[PDB]
C-alpha cells in the first residue's frame, strides 16, 4: 500500500504493558464485533505470544446512536512516543478560538484508517480483548494502520489534513479550524443559523476529499471565572463571623490586601456563639474593603506552556461540583461551577464533569489537564466508561478532599 | 506437528549461552547418547559444527519403572538471555464461573512441547555437548528442533499452537467445551455417555493428525477433578476437603496455617470465623511459641468444626438467571456475603473484613464491600449482582449526601434482616440555641465561666488536639457547642466514624451518641 513515515519511542524507552482492568460481558462483545470488521478490513492483526506488550481498551456508547465505540488508552505509547515537531507549521494555538461565539467539535478519528502505520512500530500497538473468567488469556491484536487515539496519528496525517482543508481555509477566512487529537473544532461568530449549516458544508466537503465525520456545539463567549464569594448577612453572630474571619484567611494568601483585624475585634472574647454582634463601622468598611479585592482574579498569573495544567473537583452537594485549573497552587488560571437538583449519581455527574473541563482547556490552552479526582479508584474504573463520551483520556489521580478546603469555594 | 513457528529473538544487548558441561561420568555419558541418538533419529535435535559458541550444559537422571534415565538441560542461563512473552494464561478460573457438564474427560497430553517446532533461527541457541569418554574422541554437539522442556518460551508457544490446532474442531463442534490448563485438556459436554465418548475419540484423532498423543478410556481420569486447591464434578463443585486436627498444643506456626485453612473454606462455607484464632497471635516472640487455647478461642474452633463437619458444594452458573448478593454484618467491622441465583442454592461465599482507614462507620464500610463484590462479579460471570442489602434507602442516601467524596452503588433492594446499618449520631448543621461554647486547646472555657487544664506528655500533637474534645464532651449537657482549632479532629468528628482503632476516638464517639445535640465548629489558631 502507500508510503510509511517512520516512527520510533524516545530513546531508551520500551513498549508500554499496562494491564486491561476487566469487561462486563456486553462489553467484550461489542468490541468482538468491532474488532473482526476492523480485521477483516486489515487494520488490526492478530498477533502471537511474542508480542508482550498491551494498551488497555474500551467499549463506550454513543448520544442518539444505536453504535457502540472502541476506545483505546493510549496514554502510556502517548507518553513514551518520539516528541512530534512537524516539518510544516508545528501545529500552534489560534488563541483566538475562544473569543469566538460558537465552536463546533468533529470527529475525524476515521481519517487516520487509510494511513499505514511503520512496520516496526505496529508491535507496540498490542492490545487484548479479555475473556471471562479467565478461560483463555484473551485476543490479541496489533494495529497496521494509524490508532485513533495515538498522539503521533494527527502528527503522520497532518499533511494530507491541510490539503482536504484547503478549498475551506480560504473559501471563507473567516472560519476558525484547530485540530486536536481525533477532533476537529470549527470557531466563528456567525449567527447561529447559518454557522449550523456552514458545519455542514465542511462535512461534506470532507467526505468527498479522503474521510468520513460524526457532538458537541459549544459557545467559549459565555464562560466565566465564579470569583470567591462573602456571605451577606442581615444579621452576624459570632459564627457568622468566626467562619467569615476563617474563609478571609485562607483568602489573602492569594489577594495579600485582605484585612480582618476589625473584623477579629469583634471577636475576642468567649463569646456563646449565637450572639448576634452588632457590626462597627470600622468593621463594616473592612468588609466592603475586602468584598471588592475579592471581585476579580488576583492579577498577574500566567499560563506558561512549560508547565502542567491541573485540574481538582469538589463535591458541593445536591448535584453540585466546583474545580480550579491551575498550574501553581493557589495561580488559578480559571476556576468554574458545575450543576445538572441532585438524582442522577455521582459517578455520571464527574465523569460529565471531567470531559466538560477537558474540553475548554483544549480550547483555551490547547492542553488538556491532569485530574485530581474526589473518587475511590475501584469505583472509578468500574464505572467512569458507563458515561464516558470524548475521544481522549487525560490523566487522572484520586484524592481526598479537605472539608475546609471544599467550602473555601462555596 | 506440520504447523508455523512462532520467531524468537534474544533480549537486546547480549549474546547466546556459553557455559562449560560438566564432567560427565562414562555411564551417564552412555545414557545421554542413546537418548540423544533416538531424539536426532525422531528430528526432534540435530548434529552440529564448530565455532558454533553456543552452549547449555546437560545431565542425566532416573525415577519410576525403568534402567534408563531422564534428560535434563540448564536452560536458567538461555532463559535469562530469552525476551519475555505475552503471560501464559494469566489469571485463574474460579469454579464458581463455570456452566454445568453431563460428561467430562480429561485429556493427558503429553510430550506435546516436542510436537511443536522451534523457530528455525533460534535452534543455534539451545545447542549443548555429549562427550564421549575415549582422550581424543567426539564430543558430539547438538542443537533443538522442537521445543525445549523448562525453556522459557516453550509454555506460550505450545498453548498459542494448540489454541491454533484445536480451532476447526472447536467450530465443527460448537456443543463441547476444552479448557486447556498446562497439560491436561478437559473436555466436557451435555451429550449422553455414548455420543460424548465417540466426541472424545474424534478429537484424540485430530490430534495425532498432528502428531498429538493422549490416552483412551482405560488410562484416562474421571471426575471428581481435584485442581487448584478445588474438587470439581460435573454438576457441582467444592473446595478440598479440609482437616482440622485435634491438638493440646499449638505453636504459632500451627495457628498460622489454621488461620490460611478457615480464609480459603469460607468461599463457600459460610458462618467460618477466626477472629479469637486470630488475636492469639498478638505479640509473639518465635514460630516455636505454643499459645493456650483462648476460651473464645476454643468456642470458635469447635463452631468451625461443626461447619465444615456438614459438606457443602457450590452449584455452577446458569447465564439464564439473574445474579444475586446478600450481605449482612457478622460483628463489628465484619461482613458476609453469599452469591446465588436461586434461593439457597450458593454459587459462592465470602467475608469481607478491610479497614480502609482508620475511622469508618458502617454505610461507608458497607458500600466498600459492595465495591469489592461487583469487581468480583465482574471478573467471574462478566456482569454485576442485584444486591440485597440490610440499610434503608435513606440512611444510604443521607449519609453520600454529606459525604464530600463521590460514590455510586448499583441496584440494591431492602432486606430485613438485622443488624440493620443505621447512622448513630449526627452532628448539627448550625450552631445550637443556648447551649454552652466550649472553646478547645489539654484545656478549655467555656462563655459560663467554666474552664479546665490537663497536662499529657504520653502525647502527640494530634491526640491532645483530641483530648481537649473528649473533655468538652464529657463536662457538657446533652446539647454543646464546640469549637476548636484543629483542623484534624474536626476532619475526623466531621466524617462520622462509629468504630476506630484508637481508644480516644471510641471513647467520643461514645459521647457523640449520648448527647442530644452537637455542633462543632472551627476557627483559625493564633
Ligand atoms: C474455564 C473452564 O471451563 C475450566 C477450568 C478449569 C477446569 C479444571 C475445568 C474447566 N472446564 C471443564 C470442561 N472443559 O468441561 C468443566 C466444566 Cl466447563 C464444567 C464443570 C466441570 C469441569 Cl471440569
Not at chain 2, 69 to 80: G, T
Request: net charge neutral; proline share 7%; charged share 25%.
Amino acid at each position: 500500500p502507500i508510503e510509511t513515515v517512520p516512527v520510533k519511542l524516545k530513546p531508551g524507552m520500551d513498549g508500554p504493558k499496562v494491564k486491561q482492568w476487566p469487561l462486563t460481558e456486553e462489553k467484550i462483545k461489542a468490541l468482538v464485533e468491532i474488532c473482526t470488521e476492523m480485521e477483516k478490513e486489515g487494520k488490526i492483526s492478530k498477533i502471537g505470544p511474542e508480542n508482550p506488550y498491551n494498551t488497555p481498551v474500551f467499549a463506550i456508547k454513543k448520544k442518539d446512536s444505536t453504535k457502540w465505540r472502541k476506545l483505546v488508552d493510549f496514554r502510556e505509547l502517548n507518553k513514551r512516543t518520539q516528541d512530534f515537531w512537524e516539518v510544516q507549521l508545528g501545529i500552534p494555538h489560534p488563541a483566538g478560538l475562544k473569543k469566538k461565539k460558537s465552536v463546533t467539535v468533529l470527529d475525524v478519528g476515521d481519517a487516520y484508517f487509510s494511513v499505514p502505520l511503520d512496520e516496526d512500530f505496529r508491535k507496540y500497538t498490542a492490545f487484548t480483548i479479555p475473556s471471562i473468567n479467565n478461560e483463555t488469556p484473551g485476543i490479541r491484536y496489533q494495529y497496521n494502520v494509524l490508532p485513533q487515539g495515538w498522539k503521533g496519528s494527527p502528527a503522520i496525517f497532518q499533511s494530507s489534513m491541510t490539503k482536504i482543508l484547503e478549498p475551506f481555509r480560504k473559501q471563507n477566512p473567516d472560519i476558525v479550524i484547530y485540530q486536536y487529537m481525533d477532533d476537529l473544532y470549527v470557531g466563528s461568530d456567525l449567527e447561529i443559523g447559518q454557522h449550523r449549516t456552514k458545519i455542514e458544508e465542511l462535512r461534506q466537503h470532507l467526505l468527498r476529499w479522503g474521510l468520513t465525520t460524526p457532538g458537541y456545539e459549544l459557545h467559549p463567549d459565555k464562560w466565566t471565572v465564579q470569583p470567591i464569594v462573602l456571605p451577606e448577612k442581615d444579621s452576624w453572630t459570632v459564627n457568622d463571623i468566626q467562619k467569615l474571619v476563617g474563609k478571609l484567611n485562607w483568602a489573602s494568601q492569594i489577594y495579600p490586601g485582605i484585612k480582618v483585624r476589625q473584623l477579629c475585634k469583634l471577636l475576642r472574647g468567649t463569646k456563646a456563639l449565637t450572639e448576634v454582634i452588632p457590626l462597627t463601622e470600622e468593621a463594616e468598611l473592612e468588609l466592603a474593603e475586602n468584598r471588592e479585592i475579592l471581585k476579580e482574579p488576583v492579577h498577574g498569573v500566567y499560563y506558561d506552556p512549560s508547565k502542567d495544567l491541573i485540574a481538582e473537583i469538589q463535591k458541593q452537594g445536591q448535584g453540585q461540583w466546583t474545580y480550579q485549573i491551575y498550574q501553581e497552587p493557589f495561580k488559578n488560571l480559571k476556576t468554574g461551577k458545575y450543576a445538572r437538583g441532585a438524582h442522577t449519581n455521582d459517578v455520571k455527574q464527574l465523569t460529565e464533569a471531567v470531559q466538560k473541563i477537558t474540553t475548554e482547556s483544549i480550547v483555551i490552552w490547547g492542553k488538556t489537564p491532569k485530574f485530581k479526582l474526589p473518587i475511590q479508584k475501584e469505583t472509578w474504573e468500574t464505572w467512569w466508561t458507563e458515561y464516558w463520551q470524548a475521544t481522549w483520556i487525560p490523566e487522572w489521580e484520586f484524592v481526598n478532599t479537605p472539608p475546609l478546603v471544599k467550602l473555601w469555594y462555596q | 506437528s506440520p504447523i508455523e513457528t512462532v520467531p524468537v529473538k534474544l533480549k537486546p544487548g547480549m549474546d547466546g549461552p556459553k557455559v562449560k558441561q560438566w564432567p560427565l561420568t562414562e555411564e551417564k555419558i552412555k545414557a545421554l547418547v542413546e537418548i540423544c541418538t533416538e531424539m536426532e533419529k525422531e528430528g526432534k535435535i540435530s548434529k552440529i559444527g564448530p565455532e558454533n559458541p553456543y552452549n547449555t550444559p546437560v545431565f542425566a537422571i532416573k525415577k519410576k519403572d525403568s534402567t534408563k534415565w531422564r534428560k535434563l538441560v540448564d536452560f536458567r542461563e538461555l532463559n535469562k538471555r530469552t525476551q519475555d512473552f505475552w503471560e501464559v494464561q494469566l489469571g485463574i478460573p474460579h469454579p464458581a464461573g463455570l456452566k454445568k457438564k453431563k460428561s467430562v474427560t480429561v485429556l493427558d497430553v503429553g510430550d506435546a512441547y516436542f510436537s511443536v517446532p522451534l523457530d528455525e533461527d533460534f535452534r543455534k541457541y539451545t545447542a549443548f555437548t555429549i562427550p564421549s569418554i575415549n582422550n581424543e574422541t567426539p564430543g558430539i554437539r547438538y542443537q533443538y528442533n522442537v521445543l525445549p522442556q523448562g525453556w522459557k518460551g516453550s509454555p506460550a508457544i505450545f498453548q498459542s499452537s494448540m489454541t491454533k490446532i484445536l480451532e476447526p474442531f472447536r467450530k465443527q463442534n460448537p456443543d463441547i467445551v476444552i479448557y486447556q490448563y498446562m497439560d491436561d485438556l478437559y473436555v466436557g459436554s451435555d451429550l449422553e455417555i455414548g455420543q460424548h465418548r465417540t466426541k472424545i475419540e474424534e478429537l484424540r484423532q485430530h490430534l495425532l493428525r498432528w502428531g498429538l498423543t493422549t490416552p483412551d478410556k482405560k488410562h484416562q481420569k474421571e471426575p471428581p477433578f481435584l485442581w487448584m486447591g478445588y474438587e470439581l464434578h460435573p454438576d457441582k463443585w467444592t473446595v478440598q476437603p479440609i482437616v482440622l486436627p485435634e491438638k493440646d498444643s499449638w505453636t504459632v506456626n500451627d495457628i498460622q496455617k489454621l488461620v490460611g485453612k478457615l480464609n480459603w473454606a469460607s468461599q463457600i462455607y459460610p458462618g467460618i470465623k477466626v477472629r479469637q484464632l486470630c488475636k492469639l497471635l498478638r505479640g509473639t516472640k518465635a514460630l516455636t511459641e505454643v499459645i493456650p487455647l483462648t476460651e473464645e478461642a476454643e468456642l470458635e474452633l469447635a463452631e468451625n468444626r461443626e461447619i465444615l463437619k456438614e459438606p457443602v458444594h457450590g452449584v455452577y452458573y446458569d447465564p439464564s438467571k439473574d445474579l444475586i448478593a446478600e450481605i449482612q454484618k457478622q460483628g463489628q467491622g465484619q461482613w458476609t456475603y453469599q452469591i446465588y441465583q436461586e434461593p439457597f442454592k450458593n454459587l459462592k461465599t465470602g467475608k469481607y473484613a478491610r479497614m480502609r482507614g482508620a475511622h469508618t462507620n458502617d454505610v461507608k464500610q458497607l458500600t466498600e464491600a459492595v465495591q469489592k463484590i461487583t469487581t468480583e462479579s465482574i471478573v467471574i460471570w462478566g456482569k454485576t449482582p442485584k444486591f440485597k442489602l440490610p440499610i434503608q434507602k435513606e440512611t444510604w442516601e443521607t449519609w453520600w449526601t454529606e459525604y464530600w467524596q463521590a460514590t455510586w452503588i448499583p441496584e440494591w433492594e431492602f432486606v430485613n434482616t438485622p443488624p440493620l446499618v443505621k447512622l448513630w449520631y449526627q452532628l448539627e448543621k448550625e450552631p445550637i440555641v443556648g447551649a454552652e461554647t466550649f472553646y478547645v486547646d489539654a484545656g478549655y472555657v467555656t462563655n459560663r465561666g467554666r474552664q479546665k487544664v490537663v497536662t499529657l506528655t504520653d502525647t502527640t500533637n494530634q491526640k491532645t488536639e483530641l483530648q481537649a474534645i473528649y473533655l468538652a464532651l464529657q463536662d457538657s449537657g446533652l446539647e454543646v457547642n464546640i469549637v476548636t482549632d484543629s483542623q484534624y479532629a474536626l476532619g475526623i468528628i466531621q466524617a462520622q466514624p462509629d468504630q476506630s482503632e484508637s481508644e480516644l476516638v471510641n471513647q467520643i464517639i461514645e459521647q457523640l451518641i449520648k448527647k442530644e445535640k452537637v455542633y462543632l465548629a472551627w476557627v483559625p489558631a493564633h
